[PDB]
Amino acid sequence: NYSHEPNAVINLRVWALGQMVWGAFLAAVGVVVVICLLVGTYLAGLLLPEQSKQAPSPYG
Amino acid sequence: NYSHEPNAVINLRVWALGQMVWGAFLAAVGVVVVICLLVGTYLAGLLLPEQSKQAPSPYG
Amino acid sequence: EYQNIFTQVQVGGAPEMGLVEGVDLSNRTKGTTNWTLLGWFGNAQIGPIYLGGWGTVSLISGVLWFMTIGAWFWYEAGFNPAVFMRDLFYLSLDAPDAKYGLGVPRDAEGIMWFIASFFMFVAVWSWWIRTYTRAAALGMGKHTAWAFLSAIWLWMVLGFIRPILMGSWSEAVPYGIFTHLDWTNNFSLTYGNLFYNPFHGLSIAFLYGSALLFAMHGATILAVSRFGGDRELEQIVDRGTAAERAALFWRWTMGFNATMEGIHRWAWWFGVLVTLTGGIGILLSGTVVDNWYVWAQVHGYAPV
Amino acid sequence: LSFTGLSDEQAQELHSVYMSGLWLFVTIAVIAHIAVYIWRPWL
Amino acid sequence: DLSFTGLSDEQAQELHSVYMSGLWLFVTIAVIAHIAVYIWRPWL
Amino acid sequence: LSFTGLSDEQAQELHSVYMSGLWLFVTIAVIAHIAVYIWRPWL
Amino acid sequence: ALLSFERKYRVPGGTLVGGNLFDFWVGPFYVGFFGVTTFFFAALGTLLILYGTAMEGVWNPQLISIEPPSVENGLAFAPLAEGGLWQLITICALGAFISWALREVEICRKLGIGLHIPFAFSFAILAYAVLVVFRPLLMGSWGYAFPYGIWTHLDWVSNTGYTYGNFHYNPAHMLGISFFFTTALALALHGALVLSAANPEKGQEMKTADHEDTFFRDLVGYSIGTLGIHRLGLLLALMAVFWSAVCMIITGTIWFDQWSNWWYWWVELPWWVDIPGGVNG
Amino acid sequence: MSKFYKIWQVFDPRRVFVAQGVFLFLLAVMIHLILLSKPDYNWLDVGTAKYGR
Amino acid sequence: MSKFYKIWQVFDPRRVFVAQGVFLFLLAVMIHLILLSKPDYNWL
Amino acid sequence: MSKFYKIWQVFDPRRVFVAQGVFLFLLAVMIHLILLSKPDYNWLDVGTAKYGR
Amino acid sequence: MSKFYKIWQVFDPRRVFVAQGVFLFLLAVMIHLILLSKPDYNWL
Amino acid sequence: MVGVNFFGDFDLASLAIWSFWGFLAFLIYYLQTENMREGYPLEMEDGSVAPNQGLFPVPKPKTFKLPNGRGEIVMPSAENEAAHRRNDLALARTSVSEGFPHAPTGNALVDGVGPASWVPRRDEPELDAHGHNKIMPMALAKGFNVTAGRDPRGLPVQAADLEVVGRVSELWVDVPEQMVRYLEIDLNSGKKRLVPMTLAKIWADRVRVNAIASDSFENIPATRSASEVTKLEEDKISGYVAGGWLYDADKRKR
């Protein structure tokens, strides 16, 4: 009974928005996981001795 | 046929999001109208002579 | 979606000459007119007037007043019509010099002022009596006269009484369009800042309240005109959904309400208290208080 | 009691989804608050 | 017996129990936050 | 006599409960005014 | 809490926003969405006024004054102790007024009556805004608005009016005055007329609209009608406030000098300037 | 002192409750603001001073 | 703590969801405008 | 104390809850502003100075 | 220009809407990260 | 009398302002008591009499002596309220608590509830001083002619659902006021029905009635006389029509 939208257009509009936002939520999840990955990497690197950030370059 | 979501929970979730976003869109419309009002006011004030921004204060 | 501001369709008929309830019909006229420019916002009949004794007194005296001021305007203008229509607003039948005190001014400007004021006196009081009588002849109540008396109270306080108490007709108001404004300003400036005259503040409160109230009342009665709320006398005796809806609007809005007769009682007071408080606040200016900002400081509504 | 026409089952469902969204909101908000403490701390 | 609302002692006790649950939760949060604000910046 | 429709018993019960609440209010207030008088006397 | 006829009107509906949520009454009062909003805003503004005067240490209701930021603050938000309070109170006051209007609307459409009343109120909100929002923006600074003190907004009036000499010479001000006076006049006349009909001399019957029309035709030769007088007083008030808003929005934005110098365009018209006579010769 | 409950045979508890609720809240707010305007009891300024901030 | 679902038996959920949308968006702008005012916390 | 539940035999949950929400949010905003009014207890400016920003 | 509605006869709209959500969110982060990189256009 | 304090700082000015406060108090008493002549005693939703009857007491009865031998009206009185009291009300409580609405049980435009409510004014018409009926159709009003404006007669009557229902036939006028109150309709269904002019907007080609839709124009209350109309019928008609701004809105178009 509740949740009943009489109008055809409003029903279509709330559906399409749901679909679009679902996709954007997937993308955000992916971006966030990548971000956590790289950032945790950097941080764990901060736990390392100072000679890690001193190393000579290979020029390449 | 398209637009048919079998699941009860997904149907409820896309409906509630639509309701919430509708409200937020109303609020944004209001904020934007207020903003246009004040900003157009300021701008139209920039069209005025320089004595407008020179006027003495009433101290209050 | 018809808001009833401008009348859509006009109708008319033989003029409504009057109601014989003790009125002297011979002192009444018999010629009317229709002028649709008004019919759009009101009745179009510029209906018969009553030509009575008090009315004749008033017309004669006040026309002498008007034309007296115009005479002095001319003399002050060099009889040059272009000067008249140039300085028309800057001209003035200024008030007597203080040297004369309350005596009969020994100048021309002064005695012309004095006489014009005598004429105004006669006119205003005749008109008040005319209100009383027109309401006594139709058998109605004298509320209109006791309301006008309030206006007369202020007007007297300004022209006749306050000066007698101060001993100078100089204190009274000049007869000009800009000079009486200058008089108000100089009156405030001489006596402190009139704003701090509590009775000035009250007269203001009631002026603003009169506007508040008439907008309220009018907008209501137009809102409930679709249920005939405009016919009020019949909703005091035979109440209908118009009155009920208006009352309940104001109840649900601000918690209290009125009746189709008591709102009229509220109006008669917000109106007269504008000039009852003003008269007092003007009397007390200079007779009891030479400065109002200091009275405020002493009395606690203004800071040291 | 049911002033609005809903039963315990419908209300349980609706509350489940509401709190789903709520915990999502709080998650996103605590993330952003953390990042801001990173940028311009306030304590 | 007396009910200006319709609820009998049963619905009343139910509703009250849930309302007090919510109240004590609110109050727990506020107590925690007050202790924190005391640590960071005392006001007595 | 009852201007509100109560009986003596409904009133007595209501009053026991009102009294409970009032005494709780007063109790907390006393605790607090005490703590204050200990922290910054006003007398 | 009800009147003997308040029941058959206490039906649902007539709500711009909300629905069942908030369609109820608290005592005599109707509280919808906008009732909640206006209560919140009003209460907040009130408490902030009190805290502002508490910080100041003033507790006399007549000497309490919350003032706007300096003029040098310009249009930025200031510290609460130097203008922020005035600004928040202005926000809350405006929300409260607009919500009062919208509440009136909800009620007008639940009771099935026209929307003339919120319209009338809108002009007053417009003028308040002209004073505290628009005129500043165009003048460049919040500090040109008035303070929230019973006896201090009068000082603002005085100083603002003496900036341009005797404000009396502003013509839109003249029209505001005139319409205000005529409003009070018509109000008194209406009330007196009606009461004089309903409450006549002792020993006489109630009167009717015909007697009112006849009395005022007798007096001044014209009667506007029972509907026309309401129309009239309404329009008088509105045009007054219209002219009053027009008078202020042009005071320090288009005009900058004494207002007297405006009327000297009529003197200085070439065909009566040099004339030596009168006041200006 | 033994028949005070009879007050509810006079006044309606809804109104009384709302009234005293408003009354107490405003009373408390006013007393708090009073102290807050007296700088010897302004707990905020005190705690600033006592803790040297 | 587990019987909070009973609020939807009190208030229509449609209107409550719209109202939350409004409330939260307005709170967001409020704080953003609060922060924007301060140079230390403004980012533009 | 045992019988406080009868409050809902007096008041309706809907109006009471509207009241509660309004009043609590109002109070919260009020106290937050009270604090932001003091150059102290203003977390924003405090942090601004602490971190030398 | 008026017969573009025929695209929904080619592609299922459900999947297209999800895909647009993805594409647009990713484009947004791309540009924000592009702008964030530059000190002139970074706002934090 | 400058600088003359009777005691302390109290002079004529202070005495006058205080006297004014006192007079004003008495005056608020007076007015808020005279606003009690209609509506009191205060009721509950049950129709009973409540404990809170206000802090201002209902005043002492006065008397209105009506013109044309219509009798004496006493306000406040029991006859006054009981006459204008509606009964058989199609309403249902929405809750046992007070301060909540009461839903219309059936068709409200008919059941006379809500914005469509009416009040039992007396089934005697409104009269002028001479005792003639106030509202006459323009054809019985001798001498009455359209002096301006768009003569609506014969124009179709568009309604809220944009559909058409009939043609205007006659104009009912306030003869002593010289204005048009009601307009009559020759409906398609073969019936005559009135509609207030304040609810009808005369266009050039038509008359628009955005209040109600077409299904409603037929069930409008009628008049037992085609030359006169009483206050009761006026309230019924006006309420019915005005209720369409709420109860026929699902039908209103444009």
Ligand SMILES: CCCCCCCCCCCCCCCCCC(=O)OC[C@H](COP(=O)([O-])OCC(O)COP(=O)([O-])OC[C@@H](COC(=O)CCCCCCCCCCCCCCCCC)OC(=O)CCCCCCCCCCCCCCCCC)OC(=O)CCCCCCCCCCCCCCCCC
């Ligand atoms: C230490 C001190 C502490 C504080 C002390 C406080 C004490 C408070 C005590 C209570 C006072 C309450 C007064 C208000 C009640 C009125 C209610 C009402 O609306 O109608 C009542 C009701 C109206 O009747 P109705 O419903 O219209 O129908 C009655 C008839 O059937 C049909 O009607 P009708 O046509 O036959 O007659 C209509 C008339 C019924 O009344 C009358 O007929 C008589 C009305 C009085 C007229 C004047 C009396 C005659 C002598 C006047 C002298 C004037 C001298 C100037 C030259 C002469 C001019 C003629 O209707 C009214 O509305 C009457 C009220 C009029 C009030 C006055 C308005 C004009 C005054 C303007 C200012 C001028 C004077 C200067 C004031 C300042 C001085 C410093 O009448 C009464 O209840 C009795 C009449 C009351 C007599 C007057 C007494 C009150 C006057 C107060 C004026 C304000 C003074 C300033 C305050 C202090 C400032 C410092």
Ligand code: BCL
């Ligand atoms: C700058 C100067 C001072 C100031 C100086 C004064 C002085 C001085 C006075 C007031 C007075 C008033 N001022 Mg001021 N006033 C100031 C500031 C304000 C402000 C403001 C927002 O700042 C406002 C709103 C007001 C408000 C008011 C009114 C409330 C009040 C007069 C009401 C009235 O009806 O007068 C007009 C009413 C009359 C004169 C009634 C006259 C009726 C008679 C019968 C007319 C006869 C008709 C005649 C024959 C013409 C015939 C016409 C043809 C037939 C058509 N003033 C400033 C601060 N003001 C008055 C008052 O009461 O003082 C306290 C007054 O005298």
Ligand SMILES: COC(C)(C)C/C=C/C(C)=C/C=C/C(C)=C/C=C/C(C)=C/C=C/C=C(C)/C=C/C=C(\C)CC/C=C(\C)CCC=C(C)C
């Ligand atoms: C100016 O002075 C200052 C501010 C400085 C100092 C003064 C400050 C003052 C005076 C502050 C006062 C504060 C007070 C009085 C605070 C009171 C707080 C209370 C009483 C809080 C109560 C909170 C209750 C909550 C949050 C309850 C929530 C409940 C729910 C979310 C679930 C309830 C569920 C229900 C009812 C479902 C069952 C329903 C049915 C119909 C079966």
Ligand SMILES: COC(C)(C)C/C=C/C(C)=C/C=C/C(C)=C/C=C/C(C)=C/C=C/C=C(C)/C=C/C=C(\C)CC/C=C(\C)CCC=C(C)C
């Ligand atoms: C400048 O002026 C100053 C102030 C400096 C000096 C002047 C001061 C003045 C003028 C002071 C005047 C003071 C006066 C006149 C004080 C009068 C006080 C009185 C009369 C107080 C009365 C108090 C009564 C109380 C608290 C009653 C309480 C009653 C109850 C709780 C019992 C409840 C009743 C019930 C239940 C009724 C039973 C009902 C039924 C149906 C059985």
Ligand SMILES: COC(C)(C)C/C=C/C(C)=C/C=C/C(C)=C/C=C/C(C)=C/C=C/C=C(C)/C=C/C=C(\C)CC/C=C(\C)CCC=C(C)C
């Ligand atoms: C210048 O002025 C200053 C402020 C400086 C000094 C003066 C201050 C003044 C004048 C202060 C005055 C303070 C007063 C008069 C305080 C009075 C406080 C009272 C009387 C408080 C009472 C509180 C009562 C409470 C909280 C009761 C709560 C009750 C309940 C929660 C239970 C409600 C009842 C139920 C559930 C029973 C229902 C049963 C049935 C059968 C329906």
Ligand SMILES: COC(C)(C)C/C=C/C(C)=C/C=C/C(C)=C/C=C/C(C)=C/C=C\C=C(C)\C=C\C=C(/C)CC/C=C(\C)CCC=C(C)C
């Ligand atoms: C076109 O040119 C011609 C000559 C044909 C006609 C033109 C006429 C013109 C231009 C007329 C202009 C008239 C004007 C501008 C009049 C303006 C009057 C104004 C603005 C007056 C304002 C206030 C006046 C007041 C308050 C006067 C009050 C006076 C009294 C209360 C009189 C009281 C009695 C006094 C002073 C003493 C006499 C008393 C006794 C008992 C004899």
Ligand SMILES: [Fe+2]
């Ligand atoms: Fe009226």
